[PDB]
Amino acid sequence: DVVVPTLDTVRHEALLYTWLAEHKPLVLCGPPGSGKTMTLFSALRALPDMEVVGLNFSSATTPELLLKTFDHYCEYRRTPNGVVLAPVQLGKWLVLFCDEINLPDMDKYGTQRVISFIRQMVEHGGFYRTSDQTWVKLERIQFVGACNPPTDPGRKPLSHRFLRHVPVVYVDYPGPASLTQIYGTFNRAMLRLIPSLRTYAEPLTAAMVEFYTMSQERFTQDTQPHYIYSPREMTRWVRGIFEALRPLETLPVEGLIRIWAHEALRLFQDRLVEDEERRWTDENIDTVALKHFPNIDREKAMSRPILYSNWLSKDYIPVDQEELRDYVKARLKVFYEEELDVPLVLFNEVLDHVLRIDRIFRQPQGHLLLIGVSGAGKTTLSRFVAWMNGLSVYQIKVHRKYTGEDFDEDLRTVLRRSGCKNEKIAFIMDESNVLDSGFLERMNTLLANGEVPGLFEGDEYATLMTQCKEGAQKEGLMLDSHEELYKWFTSQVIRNLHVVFTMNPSSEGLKDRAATSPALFNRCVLNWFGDWSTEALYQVGKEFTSKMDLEKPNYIVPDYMPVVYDKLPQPPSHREAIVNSCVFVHQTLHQANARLAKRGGRTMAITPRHYLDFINHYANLFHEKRSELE
Amino acid sequence: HHLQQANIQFRTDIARTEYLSNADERLRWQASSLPADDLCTENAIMLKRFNRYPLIIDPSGQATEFIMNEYKDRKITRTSFLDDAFRKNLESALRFGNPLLVQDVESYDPVLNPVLNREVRRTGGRVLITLGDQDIDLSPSFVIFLSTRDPTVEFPPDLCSRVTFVNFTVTRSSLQSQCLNEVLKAERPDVDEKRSDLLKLQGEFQLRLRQLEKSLLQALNEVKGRILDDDTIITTLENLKREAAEVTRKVEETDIVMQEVETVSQQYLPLSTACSSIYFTMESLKQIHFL
Amino acid sequence: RDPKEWIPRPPEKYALSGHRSPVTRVIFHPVFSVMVSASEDATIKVWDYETGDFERTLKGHTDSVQDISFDHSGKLLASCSADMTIKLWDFQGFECIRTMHGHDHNVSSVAIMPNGDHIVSASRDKTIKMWEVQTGYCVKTFTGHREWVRMVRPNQDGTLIASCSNDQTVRVWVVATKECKAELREHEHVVECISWAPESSYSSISEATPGPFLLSGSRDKTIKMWDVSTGMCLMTLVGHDNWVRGVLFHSGGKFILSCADDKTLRVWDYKNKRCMKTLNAHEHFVTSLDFHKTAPYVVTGSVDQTVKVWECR
Amino acid sequence: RDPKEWIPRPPEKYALSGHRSPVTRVIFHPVFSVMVSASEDATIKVWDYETGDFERTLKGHTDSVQDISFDHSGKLLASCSADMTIKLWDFQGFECIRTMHGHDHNVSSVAIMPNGDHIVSASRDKTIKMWEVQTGYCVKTFTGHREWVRMVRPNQDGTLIASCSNDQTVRVWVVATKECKAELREHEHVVECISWAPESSYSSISEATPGPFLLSGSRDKTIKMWDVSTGMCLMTLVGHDNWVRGVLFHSGGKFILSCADDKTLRVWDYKNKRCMKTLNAHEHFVTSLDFHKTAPYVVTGSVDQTVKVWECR
Ligand SMILES: Nc1ncnc2c1ncn2[C@@H]1O[C@H](COP(=O)(O)OP(=O)(O)O)[C@@H](O)[C@H]1O
């Protein structure tokens, strides 16, 4: 809710107060994350007569969502001149904020059902209840909207007959010369616990400018569909830096640059796909912190692993890879006896990934979106992190004939376990667990708002109020009625429920997911795990194949030397040469899959589970044939 | 080529099928209706030495009979995915410690995901796995096999990660041998039956010679004294003489086998070449008009 | 010196070794100068802490022995392991008297109230069982926890027991009335160790803020004080860098002896809201500790298969 | 009672059986309560000597093993056999780590000096070889022996390596300087076994007839003792009626327990220079003996396919 006023902010504030004082509709178009719901929520806080109902549209949006919203937040009343729809808060004005107006799908014959429905209730002031085909007139209902421009890939333009009744105001990104004091006042707030670093505070905000401009220079949306950058990332930057130096109370300039670079690498490198842009972002970090912070210890402030953990000590301190790795081995030894007896191997990327997962899991409303091939250990690492943070893990247990009712009952049990008994729940479900469009629609609503309209109905609604009032009386709060009890339940669900969605990367699947679901790309933090690189394959090969006997003291290093793992140490041993050979085996079948596909043959998915099948079959064959020969 | 270029020596004059499979296990596989070609022998090695539970694509149906005749003493229950009593059969297979063969994996059920991923809870010495909603005591003598009839099936990567694929395709050598066998059955039946009997005889005499070598090695490994002073080693000598007589007898069977196979080769080898060419045209003709 | 001012000091008086597995629980014999430890290699190793050597071995279990316990006399011992067994041993002749069965899952901890006629047990099946030492039959069954019960511990007179569990709650039950008297849910993580207050500490906690009082160490790197009659968190001590594994009151009623997964033993003064002393204990996680009720001795058993004995000063 | 006076008593505490061959060498674990035996059937067996339970069998050598040696951590095990190979075993992993080649005959001994970095190897080819443990390469070579080098042992500080051979010599060398510091020629027959003197015996030897000192037992039914610095036989035990196969000091530094081929396990004190107790251990030739540093147990490995453990009292 902290909004520092700028020129465009107060101009659009006056505009929105004008559009909204007359109970007239308005559409805040513009690039995503430019503050269009910041300006709207600033306009709503000026007038206390107005109450907000949040709705998030998808590609598969229907007016039945608005019907459920009217069932929850409004009532049908009988009047002599017709049937009227009025909010349950008498005297207040309900306004419905739909987040994704451009997003519902344009049909084969040039129409949108929700857009024509909203135009019907705006031009004529009412709708048709289809239960008995009766004209319901809206009494105190207005609409506001937000949308991306129609020239975006996932967005479609609106009809002229709809914009004949609605004005559109186009916000933009604030630009560098506004963001510099927007985050300058934030850093002047945040550098008050440490009274010595504030002379570096104003360039640091300025530093947070320039990287972002190259973040708008190269990483366009034509490269990857999830390459969007908004001032939400700078808000994430300042709250990560604030939660870093909140309990520490002692840090030099080098530690401040280290924390800044670590937050930048956790905010600008996880969304990248290839390692080329990861190298480019690390190079940009190096040159930006060299340009804005001269005469400082570059070796002390900047190192390779840059990891920040709170597992070993209660403060957010920088720690080395080896002590963290040993603690992860000991915690796996503990963890194998409690939840799952599935063995886990490590490398440097495993430690980096579990630190990313823990960093997003620690905050309330922490939602994860993992991108990676199947068998890459996506759900096992999340299970380990969720166990270590004391979070119960829930899987939906999908079987054949999974309709929407079983999913609704599963979400009912999840929300009742999370928000009513105040138990921390890590809700895990895969991309193969999605079977209907209603699954993704209810997941989008739960990810965005933290509540589902129409999920609880009938006797289970009153059961939810009894359970919520029992949980509130156990907690200590004296609650009553239904609306504020549902508000407390929604706050508890926001605080306690962490949702992790994992898919596989795709050229068309991620492009379609970026349009059919905003909340996975607007409310979830994306971690691109990807396939296992050659460095990871060499580390798992060299770490499992050290127990057995492989060494030839007389080994001739060949002059041809086929190297596929970079930084192979020369002179290599026999074990290094054959681990590089195993990496070559995996790489040449990666090439062979494309060779088979380009001929016309159907290919099959190569996974790191196959590589862990191949390296496990090495030691079983070696121990058998050595004991056979002896 | 990568192993040669990286100066890592390997057994060059060793067949990939022969290094993994024993002779008696190969004879048991030949007894279990498997064709004698190298590809089906390789697939039998894959089914023998699995680590992930295998998915068997088979456009002809021979692998199902091979698996049934392989685990015949261990009672395989044959079920399918679209069978109504499929989860109860899987629960009974997990409780009893029975091998299980499941057909039609193109209609795959996600409910077999924790069994295929081996996500197993350890209740002390007891082993418990949560299948569906029920915790079942997993006996360690359980295997599963995921059959497929159609060859042109695409699979999701979530199922593709957890299984080891085994494809029973049709080679030119196996097809040529089967067509030669049916041509010999149709044309020269006495030569065909005596060739089959002599092949069985050569196999069992090779088994007897391997039994000689193993028994003599384990006999001389534990004499624990003077061989000359012990008269039981003279009975070992008599055993050596008898099996040397049988390995001298084996050469005449080899000569008659050689004459029979050269006669039927010069009789019907271009016929089997035409068989291979026509069936490979059959398999390649789907590239034209999809139907 | 006096029993009031015993404080452990570095370095250790003894460093005993010999276990094949991580040591899980170490305690003292009350009458004789005997110390006893157990580990995950299904054995119970009996040592002499005064002389610092090996005395005896007890091999009856099949799986990881989680927790062992004494009685008021010290002639009787109860141990629990992962094979769903409870083995009741003696001490005067060193044989296994009984083998109680009935638990569904890993029996995590056992204890005997000072009347000695009955044995409590906690397990992973979300139950607490209450067995007769004369019959080997689970007579009573406390039920109501939501998850795995970490360890259970009874009070000084055998009227109240407390259990810390994996539901992140600490539940204090009454033995006679079979009902959870206090449900304390303020800890965020799993509560791994609890302790009762002695008589001489009864005033001193009232100086820091009658009773009954209870210590509780959890995986949220904090040590909390509770009053059962009130039900609120009396104080919270922070300073442990990792998951707290063993929390025990000092015999003087003034210090707090605790150990965590940061390889340190910490002595706290709860009057000054701080840890007064920090000692490097082991190389790996210190699973359990115990203070000797009359002699200046502290035993620490840990993951790295060495039991360290410190002379208090 | 203290570990100082400990003399074993008949009968055996345990009679372990299951070897298919004569037993060549038996040693105790330094910290654990388990013992490892070596036998001529190329099977390196691991037995728990406290309960008499067979634990495990390591089969890596493709010929009969002669000597096995631990390290003081107890993690690495060095084993020598007649296949031109030496094998390094991870004791916690129970699998081999590396195999050493370079000897052209029967590797009759193997040992690890207390620096924890290398391996001694005496063999039939009249030479001693030094082996690098972590890398796996043969570094250094003691040369000068003219017959079968029987068995080799390094000193407790790791600076002296002493070896007995079949040419009636006891040759003490320095580790890196490659010179024979002491070529002791007083024994009448093949010296089959030596035993380095502990520190507590260094006074006890010096008042029987400072340091360092060394024992040796030969086929001439005599056990001689030598001062390394001077280079002469100070004292000699006679009273065995056959070949002395293994000679061993007490851990406290007073007694010498020695096994000989006349079915005798005799304890000798250099204060009286006689045999006080003679034990008829097995029914055949007794090859090796071992006595624990802290535990009152003597293990004895003999040709009769049984390994006998005797309680010291
Ligand atoms: N002047 C400003 N003061 C405070 N915060 C700002 C300012 N400008 C931008 N922001 C931040 O930019 C972010 C835009 O996010 P939001 O408005 O939620 O995106 P959307 O409107 O697309 O939902 C907000 O979270 C807000 O914190």
Ligand SMILES: Nc1ncnc2c1ncn2[C@@H]1O[C@H](COP(=O)(O)OP(=O)(O)O)[C@@H](O)[C@H]1O
């Ligand atoms: N780093 C790893 N070390 C060991 N095993 C792994 C690792 N990554 C994946 N696995 C194996 O993969 C299986 C589970 O894969 P999963 O995590 O479900 O992949 P995804 O989450 O991408 O579907 C487990 O049985 C596990 O043995």
